[PDB]
Design a protein around this ligand. Structure first.
Ligand SMILES: *[C@@H]1O[C@H](CO)[C@@H](O[C@@H]2O[C@H](CO)[C@@H](O[C@@H]3O[C@H](CO)[C@@H](O)[C@H](O[C@H]4O[C@H](CO)[C@@H](O)[C@H](O)[C@@H]4O)[C@@H]3O)[C@H](O)[C@H]2NC(C)=O)[C@H](O)[C@H]1NC(C)=O
Ligand SMILES: *[C@@H]1O[C@H](CO)[C@@H](O[C@@H]2O[C@H](CO)[C@@H](O[C@@H]3O[C@H](CO)[C@@H](O)[C@H](O[C@H]4O[C@H](CO)[C@@H](O)[C@H](O)[C@@H]4O)[C@@H]3O)[C@H](O)[C@H]2NC(C)=O)[C@H](O)[C@H]1NC(C)=O
Ligand SMILES: O=C(N[C@@H](CCCCNC(=O)c1ccc(I)cc1)C(=O)O)N[C@@H](Cc1ccncc1)C(=O)O
Ligand SMILES: O=C(N[C@@H](CCCCNC(=O)c1ccc(I)cc1)C(=O)O)N[C@@H](Cc1ccncc1)C(=O)O
Ligand SMILES: *[C@@H]1O[C@H](CO)[C@@H](O[C@@H]2O[C@H](CO)[C@@H](O)[C@H](O)[C@H]2NC(C)=O)[C@H](O)[C@H]1NC(C)=O
Ligand SMILES: *[C@@H]1O[C@H](CO)[C@@H](O[C@@H]2O[C@H](CO)[C@@H](O)[C@H](O)[C@H]2NC(C)=O)[C@H](O)[C@H]1NC(C)=O
Ligand SMILES: *[C@@H]1O[C@H](CO)[C@@H](O[C@@H]2O[C@H](CO)[C@@H](O)[C@H](O)[C@H]2NC(C)=O)[C@H](O)[C@H]1NC(C)=O
Ligand SMILES: *[C@@H]1O[C@H](CO)[C@@H](O[C@@H]2O[C@H](CO)[C@@H](O)[C@H](O)[C@H]2NC(C)=O)[C@H](O)[C@H]1NC(C)=O
Ligand SMILES: *[C@@H]1O[C@H](CO)[C@@H](O[C@@H]2O[C@H](CO)[C@@H](O)[C@H](O)[C@H]2NC(C)=O)[C@H](O)[C@H]1NC(C)=O
Ligand SMILES: *[C@@H]1O[C@H](CO)[C@@H](O[C@@H]2O[C@H](CO)[C@@H](O)[C@H](O)[C@H]2NC(C)=O)[C@H](O)[C@H]1NC(C)=O
Ligand SMILES: *[C@@H]1O[C@H](CO)[C@@H](O)[C@H](O)[C@H]1NC(C)=O
Ligand SMILES: *[C@@H]1O[C@H](CO)[C@@H](O)[C@H](O)[C@H]1NC(C)=O
Ligand SMILES: *[C@@H]1O[C@H](CO)[C@@H](O)[C@H](O)[C@H]1NC(C)=O
Ligand SMILES: *[C@@H]1O[C@H](CO)[C@@H](O)[C@H](O)[C@H]1NC(C)=O
Ligand SMILES: *[C@@H]1O[C@H](CO)[C@@H](O)[C@H](O)[C@H]1NC(C)=O
Ligand SMILES: *[C@@H]1O[C@H](CO)[C@@H](O)[C@H](O)[C@H]1NC(C)=O
Ligand SMILES: [Ca+2]
Ligand SMILES: [Ca+2]
Ligand SMILES: [Cl-]
Ligand SMILES: [Cl-]
Ligand SMILES: [Zn+2]
Ligand SMILES: [Zn+2]
Ligand SMILES: [Zn+2]
Ligand SMILES: [Zn+2]
Lengths: 690, 690
């Protein structure tokens, strides 16, 4: 028979291994000829595998690259103007890699400049770190160069924070506290970051816009582009990343104030003085950045494969992940792309035997994810009306592994039940759990903070290609990978030259069993979403979390009882809406369990499909028009993390500091009204239709 | 059998007559107890008639009323401060109407004030009239009171124009040139406006927002409201309307410049001097306004009736029209509401015999239409997600008659074929066309400007309750009434106390045959929309008009060939998109004609239903976020008229006057890109789905 077990059994670890090797021999930087050739290869193979149609969708978007003949670096410069120390021009390449087109470490979209000044050390450059510096320690960052350790929050938030503090430049570095696990060797002898390793990465704050020059519309051949002065999300100060050998040289001379406490100290043999500037003898030395990167409109290519549905071809289940990498992409993204490739091969095997899924499955190899989700977002802008009206679900497929300990899942509440049920039917690949389910191992290793006997599933934020589908368009989305036991900092070799096939094969997953388990989870989700007669979404799970999120935001507000009294700030409407949602969802579930009638079925499937869609506000969130989901948005302090009831959360954040409390609390009340209304409107989509 | 002919034959002129009488005995001003009682009556009757559910949907919205104890008036005031002439405090009431709650003439939402100044006469106060005054005649309106004749464009546009010209007040009046047909007697002896008659009406420029205090969200019990200082669309200068007896007294003393030509002269025995101010002997007299109206949040009530569909209950066909009137509403709106009432009665008769429509029909009696579409818009805001995903079509039903000459229709191109086919099956009520079709009489009396043997159908604009459904939500909409042989000025007694049952019964439609024909057109459209197996929309009709509109906007641009050369302004993308739409629509039509499969059918019905939806841009038009349709918007110079490709039209309007032509032509190119993209995206919704 042709059922999920047949699909799952066709998946093979050995194929994933072969694909990963094939995908990681040369760099595949977005916008480069190498990445276009790989796109063409994938297109050809997906056709061979049996998909109905496989096309390239291209766009011309703003990318950023270093200047090959004018390299980026940082100096310590003496009073005479002599540069007495320089940071590296490249990472030492790994053994066996005379590869020529390795992009040197840089911060994509940094402006050009040669700022020269005194250093201030700002820990992780988080909102609370700048509060500590400016409010408690009374240190002024205006006209200073900020040095910050990577970790904890998206680097673009660090840069925005530094900019608003008045910094004239930002130096990002990898501290061994965050990127060197105790007792493991550095690459190539282990999976740790060497002192010469550096984390690449973009520093934009796009808030969901996609290509900086074309917000709202696809960057096609006739697109009108913003002038660079009006581009979305570009930083105004230069930024550059370095490794910890170089950072130690910059930090060791730091003077001024002591770190305020131990949470500001990393593992290097330096004081972690905050500054500003260097200790007495070196007080006249400065730090000088030299950044010469350019922003360039460049063609990118998505591969889009279609497997037409037998019964509901106008309903789309999408499996997507990116293909562009910073260098070799051993983990990010090719460990994910190899899994997608084997999933396509498996579905195609069933297709060649006469099977088709109930609903259409779309498969995507996205481009320019590393530059801000540009490929997925431009394609979703081009196809927004089709996706709006036909999109059932989106499953992401970036890195399959970032460790080998247990499963990690973020998804809409609508998919919790699907994930629980699927993982109870899959074998655990873990040592000590042979013969046990993946649900059993995952629940043991990553227990739910609220329920006994359940695993942890987190809120979707951003940082990957599901963002446009979920936060802009309101299509139910999910993601899953194998992880470690600093969940937002990345694994040690993240975005470094050292992320290679050998890293994965030697140190992460020699038997490709964790990859295979991830293929079964991602592929199994897609199979059920595309094949189940009734869509596998449980609306009651949204009702449960909505109460949790309402309790949480009420509790934040209740830190200010006098203001809530003064401005008559009531959450009664929001709790009422949540109560109604709970009641209506329970009744809908009863009807769904209780109906041969394909119109009632589809009517009910449409109610399930449009339920995520109902949380979209067409006016967007304040000053973030492309984040339209009222329940979830990426955190304003950390793009990687999701925030619940974000419009109310941001209205309450640091509210005690606002100089017009009447206005500030007014806006809290406005956000409570928008949230209560949206929850009740979403509930009403589940009521009997007439 | 239960077919359209059975529905149509059940409609009776005598019932419409009885309902009109019943609806027009007392005033039904929005927000008043009288209008709430009528709502309750309608709700009860719709239940009796056989609808499945009939509910009231209430909202608390900003309304405006005169102060009962501090009346509005205008004076001529001498140098001593003596008010030597005063305008009327009320219209002389018609014969047989000691009715107490007749609202005196006022301009709803006028601010309060007592401005005193010199008069400038500005013709119809259109954009081109102010261009003529300011650019050609060199007359400065700053600090002047403007007097303008009603007619040609929505009064709110006049007021906005006056405000931007620097006027400190606006006096609106009805000239007998526009409101007194030659050879007909004034009310009560004929249908003309007497010298004491006055046209009420709101002067807001809401641009689709609905309630001024709650743009985007329904004005429910917990709604957060804007402060009045941030309310949408309120004028900043006082405004008041008067009749032509009073206007003659204001105009007869006017001096300064002669009218520039005869198109500035009405029919009163005055010079129509433009001013500023009065002729020599009266040069020291001034005009003083006294406006004391108040804006007040007030409860309004929509009646919403449901007739559940037998097969597709989650697809909604909506018949809606308003119930609130300025005074008795003999024509506006009760001639329409009486027709809706008889339509409900007819559908209910079929229901009581065991029939149900295929799709759900919703019937609406809207409140506060006269104050800016407030009832329909708040309800659509509350229900936007249901309407988005389930709304098939909206048919409006305000005034059924504004004359007795021929049919008038405005609708989306998607309904052209439906209207042609329906009117070929209906009997003409016209003298001289007995035994002929309504299509034949209508085509003879109102020929299409482009096609021989076809009738004229116009573009939807605004000024009525379809606006939110069509321009904000992208639901296919239409409207139809009987009309005269100044198509935007209104009939002579429009919004006056003289619009009574007797006006209609004596002078417009004694046999109620034109009302019955309008009931057959509106009801027949609803019947076919709710009952036809395939939705009765022809996408090829949109392809035809899109080419027409593209040719028209190109021709406007081509008035500036040097700039098009300099800034490389090309319409090639827009013509390409239109060509593609034409090709794809033709192929879709072929498939629609060529498929026992209810999924392919519904899939195809969903493609038809979402086609109007595809022209919506979620970012809205520039500075008009609630006008989201890219093909049609209300004209920026006249809310009543529709404009095609409005974003490009407004970018090109008066472009030769912009002081940065590079920027202005850049924005033209941006709008061409948005339009080309939207047309191609709409086309692609008609492609094979996978
Ligand atoms: C959750 O679902 C429930 C339905 O089970 C829904 O209840 C609705 O609550 C509203 C808001 O409170 C009720 O609104 C009332 O409606 C009546 C007429 O039906 C009015 O007379 C009321 O107004 C008077 O009282 C007000 C409050 O004191 C005064 O401010 C006002 O000026 C009037 O004097 C009031 O508008 C509505 O009737 C119910 N509907 C029901 C029970 O069917 C509730 O709103 C849902 N929650 C959310 C957040 O939507
Ligand atoms: C109407 O529908 C037609 C399809 O029938 C659709 O045609 C598409 O036109 C685009 C835009 O011109 C084509 O885009 C080209 O794609 C090829 C690869 O397929 C590229 O190599 C081309 O780029 C080169 O040439 C450009 C122009 O000189 C250069 O600026 C560029 O830098 C490159 O050198 C170009 O992007 C596309 O292939 C077709 N698709 C087809 C024929 O299937 C048309 O776009 C539709 N109209 C609208 C308004 O959407
Ligand atoms: O590297 C990226 N994403 C990586 C980020 C890895 C560090 C933070 N991890 C998480 O947010 C995370 C959360 C849940 C799960 I299951 C897996 C990973 C990824 O999702 O695997 N994206 C790029 C590009 C980017 C895209 C959008 N917005 C910001 C940056 C980047 O962060 O530089
Ligand atoms: O009176 C209103 N509408 C009337 C306007 C009558 C004069 C202009 N006529 C048209 O625009 C028109 C166009 C096509 C057809 I078929 C029938 C009438 C109506 O549509 O019958 N609406 C109110 C309230 C209003 C609503 C929205 N925007 C502005 C005003 C007003 O104009 O004062
Ligand atoms: C990755 O695998 C692909 C597919 O097997 C390889 O591309 C093929 O290479 C052979 C030999 O050059 C050609 O005959 C085919 O035309 C290619 N097929 C394609 C592109 O679909 C490719 O060589 C492998 N790459 C690496 C680095 O191992
Ligand atoms: C750091 O790099 C800079 C730039 O290459 C070096 O400074 C240059 O040295 C050469 C010859 O020694 C001079 O001709 C250039 O004018 C210098 N350029 C600048 C901008 O100063 C510098 O020597 C390097 N420092 C160290 C310690 O290696
Ligand atoms: C996950 O599995 C559970 C247990 O099988 C499913 O819940 C059952 O669903 C069937 C079909 O409606 C009902 O008859 C049972 O009463 C349910 N058991 C319960 C709720 O304990 C559940 O639907 C599955 N989730 C999916 C498919 O998303
Ligand atoms: C309009 O018609 C309605 C319905 O026939 C009339 O309201 C009814 O009046 C009678 C006599 O007062 C009552 O017994 C009913 O309770 C009413 N029915 C309703 C409100 O549904 C009303 O009198 C008529 N109005 C006018 C002005 O003629
Ligand atoms: C126009 O109306 C005004 C206001 O009622 C009249 O002026 C008032 O006249 C009374 C007594 O005659 C005075 O006590 C008030 O002080 C006046 N008020 C103002 C504001 O001037 C005026 O007489 C009327 N003019 C005409 C020609 O009828
Ligand atoms: C209006 O009526 C025309 C003429 O009957 C309909 O066009 C016909 O539709 C049938 C059914 O698809 C076709 O077999 C004929 O070839 C059509 N005749 C033509 C195009 O001349 C048309 O569909 C009707 N419009 C509606 C229902 O919206
Ligand atoms: C890169 O730097 C070189 C060498 O100085 C220079 O000639 C060229 O303009 C730069 N390339 C850019 C800015 O794209
Ligand atoms: C920081 O420094 C500059 C002067 O160099 C000053 O303009 C700025 O306002 C200072 N900010 C604070 C908070 O002291
Ligand atoms: C894989 O698991 C083993 C056993 O616990 C561990 O020692 C090793 O470090 C893991 N590899 C990674 C990359 O976490
Ligand atoms: C109306 O005018 C009266 C009489 O002068 C005044 O007392 C009252 O305040 C006004 N009503 C309003 C402004 O609503
Ligand atoms: C009109 O009049 C005022 C002075 O009373 C002046 O400020 C304004 O600029 C004038 N406008 C023009 C166009 O002359
Ligand atoms: C009704 O039609 C007749 C005959 O042409 C005409 O004389 C009369 O004025 C019409 N009534 C209206 C209100 O147009
Ligand atoms: Ca874009
Ligand atoms: Ca509102
Ligand atoms: Cl992922
Ligand atoms: Cl109408
Ligand atoms: Zn990635
Ligand atoms: Zn990455
Ligand atoms: Zn009306
Ligand atoms: Zn009206």
């Amino acid at each position: 028979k042709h059922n999920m077990k047949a699909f799952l059994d066709e998946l093979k670890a050995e194929n994933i291994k072969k694909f990963l090797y094939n995908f990681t021999q040369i760099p595949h930087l977005a916008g480069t000829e190498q990445n276009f050739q790989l796109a063409k290869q994938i297109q050809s193979q997906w056709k061979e595998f049996g998909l109905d149609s496989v096309e390239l969708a291209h766009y011309d978007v703003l990318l950023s690259y270093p200047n090959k003949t004018h390299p980026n670096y940082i100096s310590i410069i003496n009073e005479d103007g002599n540069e007495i120390f320089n940071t590296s021009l490249f990472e030492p390449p790994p053994p066996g890699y005379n590869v020529s087109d390795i992009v040197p470490p840089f911060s994509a979209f940094s402006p050009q400049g040669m700022p020269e000044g005194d250093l201030v050390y700002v820990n992780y450059a988080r909102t609370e770190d700048f509060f500590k510096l400016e409010r408690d320690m009374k240190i002024n960052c205006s006209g200073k160069i900020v040095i910050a350790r990577y970790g904890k929050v998206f680097r673009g938030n660090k840069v925005k924070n530094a900019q608003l503090a008045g910094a004239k430049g930002v130096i990002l570095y990898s501290d061994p506290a965050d990127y060197f696990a105790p007792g493991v060797k550095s690459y190539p002898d282990g999976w740790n970051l060497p002192g010469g390793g550096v984390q690449r990465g973009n520093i934009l704050n796009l808030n969901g816009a996609g290509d900086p020059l074309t917000p709202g519309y696809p960057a096609n051949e006739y697109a009108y582009r913003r002038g660079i002065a009006e581009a979305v999300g570009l930083p105004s100060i230069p930024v550059h990343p370095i490794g910890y050998y170089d950072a130690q040289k910059l930090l060791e001379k730091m003077g001024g104030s002591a770190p305020p406490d131990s949470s500001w100290r990393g593992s290097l043999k330096v004081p972690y003085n905050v500054g500003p500037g260097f200790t007495g003898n070196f007080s006249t030395q400065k730090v000088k950045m030299h950044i010469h990167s350019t922003n360039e409109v460049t063609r990118i290519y998505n591969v889009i494969g279609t497997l037409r549905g037998a019964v509901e071809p106008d309903r789309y289940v999408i499996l997507g992940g990116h293909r562009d990498s910073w260098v070799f992409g051993g983990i990010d993204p090719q460990s994910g792309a190899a899994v997608v490739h084997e999933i396509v091969r498996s579905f195609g095997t069933l297709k060649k035997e006469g099977w088709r899924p109930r609903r259409t499955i779309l498969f995507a190899s996205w481009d320019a994810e590393e530059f801000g989700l540009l490929g997925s977002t431009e394609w979703a802008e081009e196809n927004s009306r089709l996706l709006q009206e036909r999109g059932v679900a989106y499953i992401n497929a970036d890195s399959s592994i970032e460790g080998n300990y247990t499963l990690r899942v973020d998804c809409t509440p609508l998919m919790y039940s699907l994930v629980h049920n699927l993982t109870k039917e899959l074998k655990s690949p873990d040592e000590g759990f042979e013969g046990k389910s993946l649900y059993e191992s995952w629940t043991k290793k990553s227990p739910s903070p609220e329920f006994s006997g359940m695993p942890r599933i987190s809120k979707l934020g951003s940082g990957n290609d599901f963002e446009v589908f979920f936060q802009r368009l309101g299509i139910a989305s999910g993601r899953a990978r194998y992880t470690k036991n600093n969940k937002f900092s990345g694994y040690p070799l993240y975005h470094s030259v050292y992320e290679t096939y050998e890293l994965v094969e030697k140190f992460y997953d020699p038997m490709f069993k964790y990859h295979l388990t991830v293929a079964q989870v991602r592929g199994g989700m897609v199979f059920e979403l595309a094949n189940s007669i009734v869509l596998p979404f449980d609306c009651r799970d949204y009702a449960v979390v909505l109460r949790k999120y309402a309790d949480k935001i009420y509790s934040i507000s209740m830190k200010h009882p006098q203001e809530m009294k003064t401005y008559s700030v009531s959450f009664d409407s929001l709790f009422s809406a949540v109560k109604n949602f709970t009641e209506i969802a329970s009744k809908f579930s009863e009807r769904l369990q209780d109906f041969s009638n394909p119109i009632v079925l589809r009517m009910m499937n449409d109610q399930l499909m449009f339920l995520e869609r109902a949380f979209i506000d067409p006016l967007g969130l304040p000053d973030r028009p492309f984040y339209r989901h009222v329940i979830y948005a990426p955190s304003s302090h950390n793009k990687y993390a999701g925030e619940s009831f974000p419009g109310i959360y941001d209205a309450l954040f640091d509210i005690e500091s606002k100089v017009d409390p009447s206005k500030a609390w007014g806006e809290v009340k406005r956000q409570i009204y928008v949230a209560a209304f949206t929850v009740q409107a979403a509930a009403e989509t589940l009521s009997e239709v007439a």
